Amino acid sequence: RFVGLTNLGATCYLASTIQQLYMIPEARQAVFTAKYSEDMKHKTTLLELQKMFTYLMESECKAYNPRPFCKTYTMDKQPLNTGEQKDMTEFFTDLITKIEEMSPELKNTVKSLFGGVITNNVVSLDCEHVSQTAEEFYTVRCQVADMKNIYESLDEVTIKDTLEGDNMYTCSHCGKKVRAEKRACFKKLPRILSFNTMRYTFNMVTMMKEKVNTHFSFPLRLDMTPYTEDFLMESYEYDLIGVTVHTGTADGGHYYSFIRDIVNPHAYKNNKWYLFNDAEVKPFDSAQLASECFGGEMTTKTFMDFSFEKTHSAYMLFYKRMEPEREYKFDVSSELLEWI
Ligand SMILES: [Zn+2]
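Above: the input record for the complex with zinc ion. Below: its predicted structure, written as tokens.
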């Protein structure tokens, strides 16, 4: 049905990343049909990702052992350590950027599928000059602390701040100190929008990072129009297709994934979801997304109620752009079909 990925030690973050990539048809097919070139920058990683995807699609087993892929993977220091819990957002961004660097073809596919452009504007209120700079992204960081839902988070990402009094902007054109309005807006949005729902605050008394477990909701249907460049200064509506959940603390936490099957049509109409948790994959009742992903308090019996905040909650949200109008053909190379 669906194949898991064996945890090699502390590789929760890898399994969540590869499975969500695998379940995005456009990404699965671009990996299978990738064009190799003799002097390409991540050649072995490509082959091992092709094999992983091939194994996930065609293996009769229950789990792939991603050890060959890890042993070819380099992030900052040369090897990828099997027993260190990497940040999932960082790994997702690292992999996607590797794929982008493989070839011009893949860079174009990746920038369209996962990439977007933020514009940072500053509008002077005391001269005619404007400044605007572009910022590319693959994920959008969304503050969860003191926010009730992802719209309030995006209101904060997109907040118009005015530089005044002591914080006066210096216009580079006329060299004057000026009041100005500074604002971030989305100029281009990817087909697959990824949000890192960030629950960590720096307690600068402990000098440590602490997880926020308050309630934070997000909808199945999201309208990005009010955050777009046109609105502030192709469809903008999205459907939720996956949630990477983090449970525990920053230190000793773990990741697992609720993912929608958008590959299988006569099952996509039935809104079938699955829980991908290392080597174990099983169907998920998506009516339970709020319970499993929104955080906030729950109660249990101790006889009296005992109340605590859930330590499991959304870590990354995956949204797919709505398209007005398939059964997918994946072209695994003949040689890989031989291997599997
Ligand atoms: Zn000026």
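Notes for the reader.
The first helix runs from residue 12 to 22.
Residues 4-339 form a domain with the Cathepsin B; Chain A fold (CATH 3.90.70.10).
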